[PDB]
Design an enzyme around this catalytic site. Sequence first.
Site, PDB file in Angstrom:
ATOM      1  N   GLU A  35       1.007  -0.968   0.037  1.00  0.00           N
ATOM      2  CA  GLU A  35      -0.004   0.269   0.092  1.00  0.00           C
ATOM      3  C   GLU A  35       0.799   1.257   0.064  1.00  0.00           C
ATOM      4  O   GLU A  35       0.514   2.161  -0.642  1.00  0.00           O
ATOM      5  CB  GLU A  35      -0.829  -0.002   1.297  1.00  0.00           C
ATOM      6  CG  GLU A  35      -1.956  -1.122   1.202  1.00  0.00           C
ATOM      7  CD  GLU A  35      -2.838  -0.979  -0.050  1.00  0.00           C
ATOM      8  OE1 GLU A  35      -2.975   0.176  -0.725  1.00  0.00           O
ATOM      9  OE2 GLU A  35      -3.966  -1.782  -0.251  1.00  0.00           O
ATOM     10  N   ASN A  46      -7.565   8.690  -5.936  1.00  0.00           N
ATOM     11  CA  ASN A  46      -8.379   7.727  -6.748  1.00  0.00           C
ATOM     12  C   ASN A  46      -9.164   8.596  -7.790  1.00  0.00           C
ATOM     13  O   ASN A  46      -9.368   9.729  -7.650  1.00  0.00           O
ATOM     14  CB  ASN A  46      -9.271   7.017  -5.682  1.00  0.00           C
ATOM     15  CG  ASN A  46      -8.762   6.459  -4.480  1.00  0.00           C
ATOM     16  OD1 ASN A  46      -7.708   5.696  -4.798  1.00  0.00           O
ATOM     17  ND2 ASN A  46      -9.140   6.661  -3.205  1.00  0.00           N
ATOM     18  N   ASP A  48     -12.336   8.411  -8.610  1.00  0.00           N
ATOM     19  CA  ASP A  48     -13.345   9.129  -8.175  1.00  0.00           C
ATOM     20  C   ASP A  48     -13.365  10.404  -7.457  1.00  0.00           C
ATOM     21  O   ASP A  48     -14.379  10.951  -7.002  1.00  0.00           O
ATOM     22  CB  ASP A  48     -14.302   8.059  -7.532  1.00  0.00           C
ATOM     23  CG  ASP A  48     -13.567   7.585  -6.181  1.00  0.00           C
ATOM     24  OD1 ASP A  48     -12.683   8.065  -5.742  1.00  0.00           O
ATOM     25  OD2 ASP A  48     -14.194   6.668  -5.256  1.00  0.00           O
ATOM     26  N   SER A  50     -11.924  10.519  -4.190  1.00  0.00           N
ATOM     27  CA  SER A  50     -11.386  10.208  -3.047  1.00  0.00           C
ATOM     28  C   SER A  50      -9.946  10.268  -2.677  1.00  0.00           C
ATOM     29  O   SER A  50      -9.232  10.194  -4.093  1.00  0.00           O
ATOM     30  CB  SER A  50     -11.974   8.942  -2.420  1.00  0.00           C
ATOM     31  OG  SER A  50     -11.421   7.838  -3.081  1.00  0.00           O
ATOM     32  N   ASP A  52      -6.475   8.066  -0.736  1.00  0.00           N
ATOM     33  CA  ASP A  52      -5.923   7.185   0.331  1.00  0.00           C
ATOM     34  C   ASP A  52      -4.708   7.744   1.167  1.00  0.00           C
ATOM     35  O   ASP A  52      -3.920   8.494   0.407  1.00  0.00           O
ATOM     36  CB  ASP A  52      -5.513   6.091  -0.304  1.00  0.00           C
ATOM     37  CG  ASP A  52      -6.584   5.072  -1.265  1.00  0.00           C
ATOM     38  OD1 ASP A  52      -7.926   5.478  -0.915  1.00  0.00           O
ATOM     39  OD2 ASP A  52      -6.288   4.224  -1.925  1.00  0.00           O
ATOM     40  N   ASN A  59      -9.038   4.910   2.953  1.00  0.00           N
ATOM     41  CA  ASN A  59      -9.687   6.043   1.813  1.00  0.00           C
ATOM     42  C   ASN A  59     -10.573   6.819   2.408  1.00  0.00           C
ATOM     43  O   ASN A  59     -11.592   6.513   3.428  1.00  0.00           O
ATOM     44  CB  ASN A  59     -10.567   4.815   0.893  1.00  0.00           C
ATOM     45  CG  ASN A  59     -10.830   5.544  -0.454  1.00  0.00           C
ATOM     46  OD1 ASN A  59     -11.412   4.640  -1.275  1.00  0.00           O
ATOM     47  ND2 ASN A  59     -11.286   6.989  -0.465  1.00  0.00           N
ATOM     48  N   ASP A 101     -15.343  -4.750   9.220  1.00  0.00           N
ATOM     49  CA  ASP A 101     -16.454  -4.142   8.512  1.00  0.00           C
ATOM     50  C   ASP A 101     -17.289  -5.306   7.777  1.00  0.00           C
ATOM     51  O   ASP A 101     -18.448  -5.196   7.663  1.00  0.00           O
ATOM     52  CB  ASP A 101     -16.023  -3.117   7.386  1.00  0.00           C
ATOM     53  CG  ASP A 101     -17.220  -2.410   6.843  1.00  0.00           C
ATOM     54  OD1 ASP A 101     -18.080  -1.627   7.702  1.00  0.00           O
ATOM     55  OD2 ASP A 101     -17.303  -2.477   5.791  1.00  0.00           O
TER      56      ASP A 101
END
EC number: 3.2.1.17
Length: 129
Positions: A35, A46, A48, A50, A52, A59, A101
Amino acid sequence: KVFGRCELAAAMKRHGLDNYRGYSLGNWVCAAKFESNFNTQATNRNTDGSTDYGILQINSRWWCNDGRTPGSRNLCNIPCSALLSSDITASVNCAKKIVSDGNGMNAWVAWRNRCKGTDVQAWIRGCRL
Ligand SMILES: [Cl-]
Ligand SMILES: [Cl-]
Ligand SMILES: [Cl-]
Ligand SMILES: [Cl-]
Ligand SMILES: [Cl-]
Ligand SMILES: [Cl-]
Ligand SMILES: [Cl-]
Ligand code: NA
């Protein structure tokens, strides 16, 4: 901060990640390697919009607030900037909520694509933990 492999393994164990939700420390070290390359200051945008953040590339779409991710949540109740600290506590605390989650470590696509199923114990081999 750029951690060494065993330095990060030690810090992750110091903050209670080893075997958290049954994921051995090597899984966490391998996820961090792919990562962030162990760099606490890593940020990546990202497609979209967003972003990280940090050693585990958490994110802004769901987990932290950066003020520029329209429609997003902040489920870790932290500014995304806190995820870039030399001290990994905030990243660990938030990662514990993510891995709880429902999809475990699959939430980290680099873990699913590069770590899952592999000899992840190699990542802690030789470390004084
Ligand atoms: Cl390494
Ligand atoms: Cl391991
Ligand atoms: Cl936002
Ligand atoms: Cl929220
Ligand atoms: Cl904030
Ligand atoms: Cl730390
Ligand atoms: Cl699981
Ligand atoms: Na957000």
